[PDB]
From a paper:
A periplasmic solute-binding protein (Smon0123) captures unsaturated GAG disaccharides with the 1,3-glycoside bond and delivers substrates to an ABC transporter localized in the cytoplasmic membrane. Smon0123 is composed of two major domains (N- and C-domains), and each domain has two small subdomains. Each domain included a parallel and an antiparallel β-sheet surrounded by many α-helices and formed the α/β sandwich structure. All the crystal structures of Smon0123 so far determined include metal ion in its molecule, suggesting that the metal ion contributes to protein folding.
Crystal structures of ligand-free Smon0123 (N-28/C-5) and ligand (CΔ4S or CΔ6S)-bound Smon0123 (N-18/C-5) were also determined by molecular replacement with CΔ0S-bound Smon0123 (N-18/C-5). Generally, the solute-binding protein adopts two conformations during substrate binding, substrate-free open form and substrate-bound closed form, indicating that there is a transitional state (substrate-bound open form) in the conformational change. Compared with the structure of CΔ0S-bound Smon0123 and that of ligand-free Smon0123, the N- and C-domains of ligand-bound Smon0123 were 47° more closed than those of ligand-free Smon0123. Therefore, the closed conformation of substrate-bound Smon0123 is considered to be important for association with the ABC transporter. The substrate specificity of Smon0123 coincided with that of Smon0121-Smon0122(10xHis)/Smon0120-Smon0120 for ATPase activity, indicating that the ABC transporter interacts with substrate-bound Smon0123 (closed form), but not the substrate-free form, and triggers ATP hydrolysis.
Residue numbers in the entry: 28 to 500
């Protein structure tokens, strides 16, 4: 059966002749025909153009789920929940076994309009983590800090005791990597168990920047900033911060993405003798040793349009990607080309792990149509199949110690509540970022100014936004 689809990902329209989709056609007898051409590169433009047709393609795939769900509410996509319950055993069991993932699939009106492209979140939750210069701790006779007060003592010693050995007070004890204010705050306030965004607490949704922990975080950060413990240029350096500070042997500690930050030991070993930037668990504050840095559960998804003539066959195509072999196909490519089975489990080939032109394993996989964002279920075993030893070590450490808290899910709103919420959320963001940056850099006094700042947030609509967020959760 020839089945029309709108599908794009990373600027490329899905080519059904790629090995992954030829295999799935051989297994399912569904042959996709894309309405997006090989010349289109702008998925937002091509999607909107596609929606002006009198007939929609059989399957509609898009990166932004809220747009798919609105198209469902408008009647352009059909509800899927009865189709799944009646005809898609793999999805039916997946939703039963994963109530969190089921939430991502249910739209604001209680219908399912799209199947998300899920990360394997419960197997790898891990994004950012805390790193510290083990070789500096050791040469200074310091324990690994395990609380925020112990970190303070540690960063003070980094700043005052010349661990890079050059007789200059040039050490930058704590730094971040960011290119906007929200990203700076994200990597500073999590240490103090605060949040710059919305979060979940005791089943309710709350606004990070209005909390007592945020006040305490900014006050402490302002104190550490004044004492030279936090990079004087936190808000002015950009994405070059980590490379500049680590490669010049100035930086002592950070909070940053685990896979990339764990690469510096191997890169700087010949250049900085003894260099060991080491991943540690989140520091404890008042009994809390969690981090709110977490991966997300999905990105994008796909649905069936009102114009598909055989939706039952299409829900089975959707279900194929949740079978054992369909999920392995999507994640790993073709057996005998991208991977072999070793004791029942895929092991990538040299074609994937040692591409002679320098291509990454994921880039090689993408070229066969693996990992092509639709409504499939990523497998963390695909990622561990190629990730570096230090990346995998960091993932395992944070996973085994259960330190990562689930992020607030992507919430669902009607179009009108969304506009209302976004207008409020945008206005408050501007206030929080202005005030927190100035407080951290030592302007004014947060104790004297906190109340008026909270009233400004309330005047911008904080209570209404809380009401909308809690309804949506
Ligand atoms: Ca020094």
């Amino acid at each position: 059966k020839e089945t029309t689809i709108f599908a794009m990902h990373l600027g490329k329209a899905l080519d059904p002749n790629l090995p992954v989709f030829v295999k799935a056609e051989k297994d399912t007898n569904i042959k996709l025909v894309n309405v997006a051409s090989q010349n289109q590169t702008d998925q937002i433009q091509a999607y909107n153009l596609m929606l002006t047709e009198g007939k929609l393609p059989d399957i509609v795939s898009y990166e932004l789920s809220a747009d798919l769900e609105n198209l469902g509410i408008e009647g352009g996509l059909i509800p899927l929940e009865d189709l799944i319950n009646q005809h898609a055993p793999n999805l039916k069991k997946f939703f039963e076994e994963n109530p969190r993932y089921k939430k991502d699939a249910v739209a604001v009106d209680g219908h399912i309009y799209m199947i998300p492209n899920y990360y394997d979140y419960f197997n790898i939750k891990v994004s950012q983590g805390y790193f510290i210069r083990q070789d500096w701790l050791e040469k200074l006779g310091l324990k690994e800090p395990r609380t925020v007060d112990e970190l303070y003592t540690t960063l003070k010693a980094f700043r005052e005791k010349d661990p890079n050995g050059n007789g200059k007070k040039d050490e930058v004890p704590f730094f971040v990597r960011a290119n906007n204010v929200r990203k700076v705050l994200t990597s500073l306030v999590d240490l103090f168990k605060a949040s710059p965004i919305w979060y979940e607490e005791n089943g309710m949704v709350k606004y990070g920047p209005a909390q007592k922990e945020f006040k305490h975080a900014i006050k402490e950060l302002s104190k550490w900033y004044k004492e030279g413990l936090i990079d004087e240029e936190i808000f002015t350096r950009g994405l070059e911060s980590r490379d500049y500070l680590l490669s010049n042997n100035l930086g002592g500690a950070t909070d940053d993405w685990i896979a990339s930050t764990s690469s510096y030991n191997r890169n700087l070993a010949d250049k900085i003798p003894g260099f060991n930037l080491k991943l540690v668990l989140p520091y404890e504050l008042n009994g809390n040793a969690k981090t709110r840095h977490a991966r997300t559960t999905y990105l994008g998804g796909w649905g069936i349009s009102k114009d598909a003539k055989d939706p039952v066959s299409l829900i089975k195509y959707f279900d194929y990607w949740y079978s054992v072999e369909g999920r392995r196909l999507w994640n790993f490519g073709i057996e005998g080309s991208e991977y072999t089975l070793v004791d029942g489990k895929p092991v990538f080939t040299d074609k994937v792990l040692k591409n002679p032109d320098g291509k990454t394993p994921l880039a090689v996989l993408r070229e066969v149509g693996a990992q092509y964002r639709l409504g499939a279920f990523q497998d963390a075993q695909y990622e561990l199949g190629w990730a570096s030893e230090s990346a995998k070590a960091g993932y395992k450490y944070y996973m085994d110690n259960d330190v990562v808290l689930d992020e607030l899910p992507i919430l669902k709103y009607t179009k009108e509540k969304s506009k209302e919420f976004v207008s409020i959320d945008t206005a408050m963001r501007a206030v929080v970022e202005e005030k927190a940056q100035q407080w951290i850099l030592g302007s004014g006094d947060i104790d004297k100014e906190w109340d008026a700042y909270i009233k400004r947030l309330e005047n911008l609509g904080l209570s209404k936004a809380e009401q909308i967020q809690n309804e949506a959760f």
